[PDB]
Amino acid sequence: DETARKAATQLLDQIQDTPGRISLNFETPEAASVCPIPTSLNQIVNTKWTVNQLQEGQLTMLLAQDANKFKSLGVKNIKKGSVETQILPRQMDVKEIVEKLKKQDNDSDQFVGYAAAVANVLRRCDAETAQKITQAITATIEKEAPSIVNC
Amino acid sequence: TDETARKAATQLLDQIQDTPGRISLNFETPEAASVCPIPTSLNQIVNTKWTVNQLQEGQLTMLLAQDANKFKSLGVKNIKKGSVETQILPRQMDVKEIVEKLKKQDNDSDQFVGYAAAVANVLRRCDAETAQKITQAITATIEKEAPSIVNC
Amino acid sequence: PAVKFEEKTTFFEMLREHTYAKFYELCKNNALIYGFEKVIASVFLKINGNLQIIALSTGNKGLRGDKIVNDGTALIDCHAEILARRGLLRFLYSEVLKFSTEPPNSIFTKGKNALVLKPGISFHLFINTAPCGVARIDKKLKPGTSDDLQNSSRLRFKIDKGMGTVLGGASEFEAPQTFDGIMMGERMRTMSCSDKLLRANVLGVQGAILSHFIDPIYYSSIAVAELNNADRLRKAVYSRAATFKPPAPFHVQDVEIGECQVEDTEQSTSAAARSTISSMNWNLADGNTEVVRTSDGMVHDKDMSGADITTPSRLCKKNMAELMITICTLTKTSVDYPISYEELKAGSQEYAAAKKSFITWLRQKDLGIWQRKPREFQMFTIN
Amino acid sequence: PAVKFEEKTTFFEMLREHTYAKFYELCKNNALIYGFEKVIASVFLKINGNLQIIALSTGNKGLRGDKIVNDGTALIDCHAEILARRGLLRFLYSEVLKFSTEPPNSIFTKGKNALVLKPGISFHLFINTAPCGVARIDKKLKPGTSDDLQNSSRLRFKIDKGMGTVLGGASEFEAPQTFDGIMMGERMRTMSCSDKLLRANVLGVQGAILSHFIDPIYYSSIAVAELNNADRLRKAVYSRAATFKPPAPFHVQDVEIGECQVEDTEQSTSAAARSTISSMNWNLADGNTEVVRTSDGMVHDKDMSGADITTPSRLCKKNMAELMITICTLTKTSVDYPISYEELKAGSQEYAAAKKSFITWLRQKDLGIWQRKPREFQMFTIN
Numbered sequence A: 001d002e003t004a005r006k007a008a009t010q011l012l013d014q015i016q017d018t019p020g021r022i023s024l025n026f027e028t029p030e031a032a033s034v035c036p037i038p039t040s041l042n043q044i045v046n047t048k049w050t051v052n053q054l055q056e057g058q059l060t061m062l063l064a065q066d067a068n069k070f071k072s073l074g075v076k077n078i079k080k081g082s083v084e085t086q087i088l089p090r091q092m093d094v095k096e097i098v099e100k101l102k103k104q105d106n107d108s109d110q111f112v113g114y115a116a117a118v119a120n121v122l123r124r125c126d127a128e129t130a131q132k133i134t135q136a137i138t139a140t141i142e143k144e145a146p147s148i149v150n151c
Numbered sequence B: 001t002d003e004t005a006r007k008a009a010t011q012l013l014d015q016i017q018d019t020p021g022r023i024s025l026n027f028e029t030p031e032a033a034s035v036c037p038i039p040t041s042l043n044q045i046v047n048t049k050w051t052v053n054q055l056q057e058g059q060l061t062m063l064l065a066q067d068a069n070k071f072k073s074l075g076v077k078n079i080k081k082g083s084v085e086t087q088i089l090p091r092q093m094d095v096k097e098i099v100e101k102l103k104k105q106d107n108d109s110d111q112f113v114g115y116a117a118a119v120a121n122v123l124r125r126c127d128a129e130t131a132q133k134i135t136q137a138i139t140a141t142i143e144k145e146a147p148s149i150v151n152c
Numbered sequence C, D: 001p002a003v004k005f006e007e008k009t010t011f012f013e014m015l016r017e018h019t020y021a022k023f024y025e026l027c028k029n030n031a032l033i034y035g036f037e038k039v040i041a042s043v044f045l046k047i048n049g050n051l052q053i054i055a056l057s058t059g060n061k062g063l064r065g066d067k068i069v070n071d072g073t074a075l076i077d078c079h080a081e082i083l084a085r086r087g088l089l090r091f092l093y094s095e096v097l098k099f100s101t102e103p104p105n106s107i108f109t110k111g112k113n114a115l116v117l118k119p120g121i122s123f124h125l126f127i128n129t130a131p132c133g134v135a136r137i138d139k140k141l142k143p144g145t146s147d148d149l150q151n152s153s154r155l156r157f158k159i160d161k162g163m164g165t166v167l168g169g170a171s172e173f174e175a176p177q178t179f180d181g182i183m184m185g186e187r188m189r190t191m192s193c194s195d196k197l198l199r200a201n202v203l204g205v206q207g208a209i210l211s212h213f214i215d216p217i218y219y220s221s222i223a224v225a226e227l228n229n230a231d232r233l234r235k236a237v238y239s240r241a242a243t244f245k246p247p248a249p250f251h252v253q254d255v256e257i258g259e260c261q262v263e264d265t266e267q268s269t270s271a272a273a274r275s276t277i278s279s280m281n282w283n284l285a286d287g288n289t290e291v292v293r294t295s296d297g298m299v300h301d302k303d304m305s306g307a308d309i310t311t312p313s314r315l316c317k318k319n320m321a322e323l324m325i326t327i328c329t330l331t332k333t334s335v336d337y338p339i340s341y342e343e344l345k346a347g348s349q350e351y352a353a354a355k356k357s358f359i360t361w362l363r364q365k366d367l368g369i370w371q372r373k374p375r376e377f378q379m380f381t382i383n
């Protein structure tokens, strides 16, 4: 037991002496073991940047700072229409779809129910599989009824 | 405060309960008329021989029960006017170019309402034998291409 | 009790008090309508200082999209003001018949080319809450910016589920609603009560079909049980079309709004009783109450075996058309035999032209797009 | 007061200890916020072996239904982990300003098409307890039916004046929210913090407006004190959207999930200490604390010994937009005029496409409907 408690006391001091700032004793395996960080978060980069300049209230100072020394960023903002994506369909459950996709008296409903079931099956499908279902349905329609669909 | 104002207020409060929905504003005394100040635009007092009490509940039923001879004419006639949209009454006959288009087209940002409408329209026109071949076919395509969505 | 200090506001409270007083009298016959006081509206007839309630109705929901029908047997909108107007239409049909049998007994007199109200007759609308749409989307004293005011005056529409309205921005929803699309899942857009009252004060409350017989009829006053309610309701109801110039005989009615200055109905209107799904309507013409299930827009009842059955409401398109056909057949008015509901409505050149002008003017002045229902709603033949 | 058991996984322990220490340090300046720490969240900036707290916040309630506003001056959601994100947004705005003047001092650098975070700099989020929604189960979420396994991933949302979190799409929630609907008492739905953390892990924490300047920024880790919740927390915030593939600039961040060995969750401030209504937040960019009333999302203060003053929060939409325009004017990046808050957020092409794709993918995968707020919440103009 050497240097372990001497490393730990620094972390114990930070939580009481410097609230909000944490410094981890690295480059020393004995001192590094007191508070091991996850390997996914171990992004050690030799940057010239340091955290010491994060002054509290920096936004207040920068706003009152003179506008002359605020050089441009280059970017430029343009509006775009807020797409009125009103949620178009009245959703129905999967257990609901199976029955109405199975009924045989569809003509009495003028095939409204079966087509609605097909639509909501298509709506919940991903773009690739929905498109492939679309081509498949068009193909079987063109195959079975060339008389009605003149192609 | 004033006894006349109190009397008029009691009159209206009692009239609320004696015959709900029927109101008779005070006009027998100009001071008593102040209990219910009519708005300036609504105070169009005019002399007329007709009165409220001549309205009876269920008068429509009473008038329908009368004989057809008692009823006079108004010297008018009703003429049909073809709507600006000349499309036929049942939209089962979707325009052929349209229904082929929404089936062949790819951009389904309408969220498949158009494709479903086209499918319903082609289903309706097909013969009963052709319609059933089509709809088991669509069922099989649905159960084969996207089974995670249908078989819950 | 009917608590009001009878000073400076009484007339509109008398509109409020007599509306609820009549409601509870109706509950004495059919207690089933208990709890419907959440959103209630009524129409009064005024003569020389005398009042008589003409139509009474309640409701805050509409027809669901999957329950639409092409035969006109379903009530598309079941809001309190809309059903109050429909009951007023039924009373107007009754009054037209009364003129047809005894002109002295009726409210109508023969004008230049149509029936005209006798002098002194006025119709007043009362609503216990602000009508949905523009009249409700603001309650602050001032908006500050004029732009946020003008987008606050844009036309709004309801949807088949929910008790609010959605801003129908310009160049949006220009695609006509389709019968197949709504049945496929698309939500049915119906115009908000504020814009419907704007239409009522522009084109009259009598509607297209009654315009065959009578001159346009306008609400003399619109009363709401909300304390401030002053500028916002004016803006929503009259001012948006105050610069519009409808063709003759139609005109924009400078309707008056008076406020129920005490007992404003907010707690009884904005909580608890929203669980109900059934609306009811009463009118002087029939004298009895009818309860309509709003979800499917039809009145349901128990059969002789105690099971649920359905039947069209008396305020539906089909029932109104049948009533008008009965009016014509009793009055000896010649009509074409094969006609549809819209063809009969289109048969009023003046009203149709005024409505088209109003919609086009709303288009040009970018108040929004008027959400017309699919034509299949009105293609059904009646006789 | 005292940490325990070093040499274990304790980086998250240090985050918890320093969050509490910073909160207690902010207590001395403002004694009003004593006892708020029941539900506290914070964001830390990490660089190599140096840690710095940049956002700290408190609160477990949200905006009331009848106190909603259209000018964007009210804080719609005042939960601890959300106000922390808003404080982080303000800090990022300050850092953009610092880059505008002092490139070597700021955390940002000029990238290919937008500002890119400096190498080695990362942000870490800490929450006192489990995020509301999927991450926590106490009552009625227990086995017995296999279909409840779907509910272990389905979206959940909050309700104004409601408690806990309720599942979506039962009977009423499959309908858009409307301003005039929430007015008069429709329940306003706000997505749970678990789902909002999922959105933060998918589309980034910078939001739509700040995406104009900077590339997406993701939390490197999310720490929750509550023990043994790590598996469920990972499922709630990362795993259930892992298969999603957003557009090129975005990606689903595999957030590290950590927990503190010493912890407590009995503190929930719901009749636990005093049922606190107000909330507090602190940003390093501002350097001072702020207290808002979650019932209305406004800062309430007193002056001249006799007045109650309503003031918008620095985290509100109006203040964020004002800061945005101030940044643009200071940096001379021209912006269109007039422009609304909705238009400005929609102006970010990449972020809008990613958000639409994410919501659509959530809907398709039967996770739930993302409950968007009414458009009237963000239609206000900015100038």
Ligand SMILES: O=P(O)(O)O[C@H]1[C@@H](OP(=O)(O)O)[C@@H](OP(=O)(O)O)[C@@H](OP(=O)(O)O)[C@@H](OP(=O)(O)O)[C@H]1OP(=O)(O)O
Pocket: C076, C077, C082, C085, C086, C190, C191, C196, C206, C207, C208, C209, C317, C320, C345, C355, C371, C372, C373
């Ligand atoms: O229900 P109401 O408000 O009483 O008015 C309804 C109807 O509105 P809804 O669809 O909301 O029920 C139609 O209005 P649209 O929505 O179709 O525009 C229609 O108007 P059109 O006939 O022009 O289509 C017509 O109003 P009007 O009486 O002016 O013809 C109609 O009344 P009916 O229900 O009696 O047809």
Ligand SMILES: O=P(O)(O)O[C@H]1[C@@H](OP(=O)(O)O)[C@@H](OP(=O)(O)O)[C@@H](OP(=O)(O)O)[C@@H](OP(=O)(O)O)[C@H]1OP(=O)(O)O
Pocket: D076, D077, D082, D085, D086, D190, D191, D196, D206, D207, D208, D209, D317, D345, D355, D371, D372, D373, D374
């Ligand atoms: O910070 P939050 O409380 O989570 O607020 C967000 C934020 O909106 P603000 O910028 O107003 O804070 C979102 O915006 P971005 O992430 O896109 O920047 C988003 O807004 P949009 O989806 O409309 O862009 C969303 O709003 P919604 O709930 O409607 O999805 C939500 O706001 P809420 O706080 O209202 O949940």
Ligand SMILES: [Zn+2]
Pocket: C079, C131, C132, C133, C192, C193, C194
């Ligand atoms: Zn309404």
Ligand SMILES: [Zn+2]
Pocket: D079, D080, D081, D131, D132, D192, D193, D194
């Ligand atoms: Zn939460």
